[PDB]
Design an enzyme around this catalytic site. Structure first.
Site, mmCIF file in Angstrom:
data_model
loop_
_atom_site.group_PDB
_atom_site.id
_atom_site.type_symbol
_atom_site.label_atom_id
_atom_site.label_comp_id
_atom_site.label_asym_id
_atom_site.label_seq_id
_atom_site.Cartn_x
_atom_site.Cartn_y
_atom_site.Cartn_z
ATOM 1 N N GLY A 412 13.334 -0.540 0.794
ATOM 2 C CA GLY A 412 12.285 -0.534 -0.207
ATOM 3 C C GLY A 412 11.834 -1.925 -0.601
ATOM 4 O O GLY A 412 11.642 -2.212 -1.786
ATOM 5 N N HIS A 440 17.426 -2.572 6.195
ATOM 6 C CA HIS A 440 16.270 -1.841 6.700
ATOM 7 C C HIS A 440 15.171 -2.764 7.198
ATOM 8 O O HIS A 440 13.984 -2.433 7.071
ATOM 9 C CB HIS A 440 15.712 -0.909 5.623
ATOM 10 N N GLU A 443 9.466 -2.608 9.394
ATOM 11 C CA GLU A 443 8.108 -2.762 8.868
ATOM 12 C C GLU A 443 7.431 -4.047 9.339
ATOM 13 O O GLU A 443 6.685 -4.679 8.583
ATOM 14 C CB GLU A 443 8.112 -2.680 7.333
ATOM 15 N N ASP A 525 17.337 9.133 11.124
ATOM 16 C CA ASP A 525 16.611 8.768 9.911
ATOM 17 C C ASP A 525 16.669 9.888 8.881
ATOM 18 O O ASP A 525 17.651 10.010 8.144
ATOM 19 C CB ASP A 525 15.157 8.408 10.226
HETATM 20 MG MG LIG Z 1 15.755 5.214 7.181
#
Ligand SMILES: [Mg+2]
Ligand SMILES: Nc1ncnc2c1ncn2[C@@H]1O[C@H](COP(=O)(O)OP(=O)(O)OP(=O)(O)O)[C@@H](O)[C@H]1O
Ligand SMILES: Nc1ncnc2c1ncn2[C@@H]1O[C@H](COP(=O)(O)OP(=O)(O)OP(=O)(O)O)[C@@H](O)[C@H]1O
Ligand SMILES: [Mg+2]
Lengths: 592, 120, 240
Positions: A412, A440, A443, A525
């Site tokens: 996030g 993560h 992106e 995921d």
């Molecule tokens: Mg994920």
């Protein structure tokens, strides 16, 4: 069972000697003989009419004589293999004597015995070569007859499912052939360290044909093999499992207070799911799971039902070890005294109760550990991150219990106020405590962000990060530091778009990552929105990364085991169990 | 339970709040401080209850080796979460140490500290 | 040249790699460390050659004043370039210094560090991070002293380290002064650590292969060869 198989040519007295080879008589005898008229069935019939208890049969290959042609040889080989398959006892391997016939059918029968198992491959011979029944009776009485034995032959125990997939074909022709084994035999070397990527050393014990079939390219027809294989999942979000369908409906129904839930909201369905033909943005993907998540799992009943259903799906997918990320702060509300700590405690207690209950019944169970996902967005305030880190640190100190917190996750985040390059002071505490760190960093983040995650945070696993090709230094550091990489082929395939996506030319770098040596692992995921569990998630690699091999899939499983945040003793036990299960399934899945 | 039982009888009681102790050992397991801090933070999420965690305590020997000038990074989170920090600096209270506790640690209370007359 | 001439005749050879020792002097020229680092980096640009430098060694005295708590800025460049870092923290090795070497220095392999038994958290971190520890049985036996050393009941932690799951390697430190080669170093484990099995020796070899600063393709080629050679020698020894 105790079934004997022999090939009869011009000679016919070999069958009685093969019958007498055992010291207590046989029980069923089936003889495959060519269509030549030289063989005399009368002698065999009168010899076996003296013992009605045993079973006798004769099979003749139509349209074959003297097997002097390539087409004749291939037809005889196919017919003999079919006959061998038909007369296989259900459980016990059959005896076989190949003394009769010319070297052609003898060699063919020996190859068939090697391919389909044979409890005893034996020859019969005598000094005077008896012809009549009295002659060989006297020979065995004197002891002249010798039973040559070359030893027991286990064969390759899984090839009889062909019988379940190939009909009897009593009336057939030359078109009906099954060269499904000769194709691999041609594909031995028709294509360096690929032999040494051999994980689970018991694979070396495997039959040579099975070891070969491991090296053949993966195909979409291996769904059963993939499903039966024990697997490891490391990227499976808890909040995205019961997104839609019957599971979501029964989760909603099992709520303690269903009055406050919002059953009217439904997620929009994207055409072609799960293999969507269009790219999907990350924001839309996150919004697609709004049916589940924080707004629904506030009540205890919904959360418990969701966790139980997720564990049920995990054990149904043969996953033997999974690390599930949960965000307690999303499911915590102070209205009913439901703090983040009590939510995490409820999840942990449910998981450990399910694990212990499954293990007590001596069934297959999925050991589950938990990652506390610390999403560093909030409303621009960092107290949420500190609260999550403290919650994870305190949740480690539980100690007693099967399921336990193993690490934290960072997600996030976009950049600047959210970049991980300004939290290491907080992360000193979590690193000193002993938790693991997963990032993560996808992106399309800059390579400097990946570098900071690898070095500044000392992260041990990186999420997605499909842009490793553009940074050779990043690949060198990742490979040399043995830092694992987790990717979800379905999620990253829909979100980003890789071949065979129309109007898309980018290729999935999983094959290149495996070739380079990255500790790459395959995950799911979110099970719900993606609508695909680990089985199809691994199976899709046959199309996303053409040319991949089954040995690469086993390497994926081994890397998933190696990069998991587990204690060394538990890792060793898991590796041992995984290797045994993999050897067993591979020994009983090359049947089809 | 004790406070609620005393309040039910409608008599004089004693409302009590708890301060966790961030003890310093330096005989191994130096993460203890962090653990203690983490514990305090998660206890703040209890929410309800007449008695609740209200801060941490910096107990332990406070010589130059164990000053408060090295652990601002750890205490940034505990200050973000709203806990008040109390310094247990008693003997060998050098003015620099008390200054660091007051400013760097943002401590809202000083234990003992009987040597303030020496530094105007 | 030696490796190439040994490979040309198709015989057993020993592939070698280089480590630049960035030791500490403190008798002046404090820039020496930096200079050494720079040298190593420049030499990595050789590119060709079967022999190339793969890492640096943090040798020298390991007191608190010269611990790994000052040189992060210097070592950022060497980490960025692609050199592995080996920490020689074996003498007066406080757990804080070892932790700094593991995290601040990003050391991929520790030197000696025989005092990991007392610290459980440090051992857990070392095991989890999969960082190697190099221990030379003869040098440590002569210097530190372990049973059956007279008036020395201290037990060598090699067996405990192997049981815990650490990636432990056995080496020689200095062949000359120690007077024992690698084979004697491995042999001394018969009485240095009672109860160690031959499978544990194979585990030591595998750990040393895994923790070595090598490229992945070269590592897998080495592993395949090692598998063949170990199989051959074990079969020969058992059959004879
Ligand atoms: Mg994920
Ligand atoms: N949270 C509190 N802490 C301490 N004292 C309280 C608290 N709440 C109320 N009190 C006091 O407790 C006392 C209860 O006793 P009571 O109702 O008889 O009042 P009182 O006239 O002062 O006589 P008493 O001597 O019993 O206190 C009240 O006076 C009240 O002011
Ligand atoms: N870099 C190396 N260093 C040492 N040994 C190597 C190296 N590379 C390969 N080898 C091994 O050296 C051996 C070369 O000899 P050969 O091909 O005849 O194998 P062999 O059956 O073991 O017989 P030999 O006794 O000659 O080794 C190979 O086994 C090879 O795996
Ligand atoms: Mg040395």
């Amino acid at each position: 069972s105790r079934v004997l198989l022999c090939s009869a040519g011009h000679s016919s007295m070999v069958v009685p000697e093969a019958f007498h080879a055992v010291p207590e008589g046989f029980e069923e005898v089936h003889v495959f003989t060519t269509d030549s008229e030289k063989f005399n069935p009368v002698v065999l019939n009168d010899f076996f009419h003296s013992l009605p208890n045993v079973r006798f049969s004769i099979t003749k290959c139509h349209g074959l004589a003297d097997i002097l042609n390539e087409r004749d040889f291939e037809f005889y080989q196919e017919m003999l293999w079919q006959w061998y398959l038909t007369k296989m006892p259900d459980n016990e391997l059959p005896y076989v004597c190949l003394s009769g016939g010319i070297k052609s059918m003898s060699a063919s029968l020996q190859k068939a015995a090697t391919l389909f198992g044979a409890q005893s491959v034996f020859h019969v011979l005598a000094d005077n070569n008896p012809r009549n029944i009295e002659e060989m009776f006297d020979a065995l009485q004197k002891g002249q007859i010798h039973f040559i034995e070359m030893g027991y032959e286990p064969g390759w125990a899984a090839l009889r499912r062909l019988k379940k997939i190939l009909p009897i074909n009593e009336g057939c022709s030359r078109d009906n052939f099954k060269p499904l084994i000769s194709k691999s035999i041609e594909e031995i070397l028709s294509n360096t360290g690929k032999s040494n990527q051999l994980p689970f050393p018991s694979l070396a014990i495997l039959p040579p044909i099975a070891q070969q079939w491991l090296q053949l390219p993966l195909s979409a027809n291996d769904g059963a093999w993939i499903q039966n294989l024990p697997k490891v999942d490391l990227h499976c979000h808890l909040g995205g499992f019961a997104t839609s369908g019957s599971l979501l409906d029964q989760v909603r129904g099992a709520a303690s207070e269903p009055d406050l839930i919002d059953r009217t909201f439904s997620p929009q369905e994207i055409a072609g799911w799960p293999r969507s033909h269009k790219s999907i943005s990350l924001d839309k993907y996150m919004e697609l799971g709004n049916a589940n998540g924080s707004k629904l799992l506030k009540d205890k009943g919904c959360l418990i039902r969701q966790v139980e259903l997720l564990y049920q799906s995990l054990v149904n997918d043969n996953v033997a070890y999974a690390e599930i990320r949960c965000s307690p702060n999303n499911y915590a509300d102070k209205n009913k005294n439901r703090s983040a700590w009590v939510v995490l405690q409820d999840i942990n207690d449910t998981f450990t109760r399910l694990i212990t209950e499954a293990k007590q019944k001596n069934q297959f169970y999925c050991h589950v550990n938990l990652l506390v996902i610390a999403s560093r967005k909030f409303s621009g305030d960092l107290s949420d991150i500190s609260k999550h880190l403290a919650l994870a640190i305190t949740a480690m100190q539980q100690g007693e219990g099967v399921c336990r917190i193993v690490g934290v996750d960072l997600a996030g985040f976009e950049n600047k106020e959210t970049r991980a390059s300004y939290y290491e002071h907080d992360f000193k505490a979590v690193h000193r405590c002993g938790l693991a760190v997963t990032a993560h960093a996808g992106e399309n983040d800059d390579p400097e962000g990946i570098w900071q995650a690898v070095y500044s945070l000392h992260a041990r696993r990186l999420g997605h990060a499909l842009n490793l090709l553009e940074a050779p230094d990043l690949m060198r550091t990742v490979i040399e530091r043995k830092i694992g990489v987790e990717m979800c082929p379905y999620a990253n395939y829909q979100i980003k778009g890789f071949a065979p996506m129309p109007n898309f030319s980018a290729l999935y770098p999983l094959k290149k990552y495996l070739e380079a040596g990255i500790l790459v692992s395959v995950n799911t995921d979110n099970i719900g929105i993606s609508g695909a569990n680990l089985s199809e998630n691994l199976l899709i690699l046959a199309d996303l990364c053409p040319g991949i091999s089954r040995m690469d899939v086993l390497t994926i499983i081994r890397n998933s085991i190696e990069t998991a945040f587990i204690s060394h003793d538990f890792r060793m036990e898991l590796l041992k169990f995984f290797d045994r299960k993999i050897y067993d399934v591979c020994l009983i899945s090359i049947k089809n």
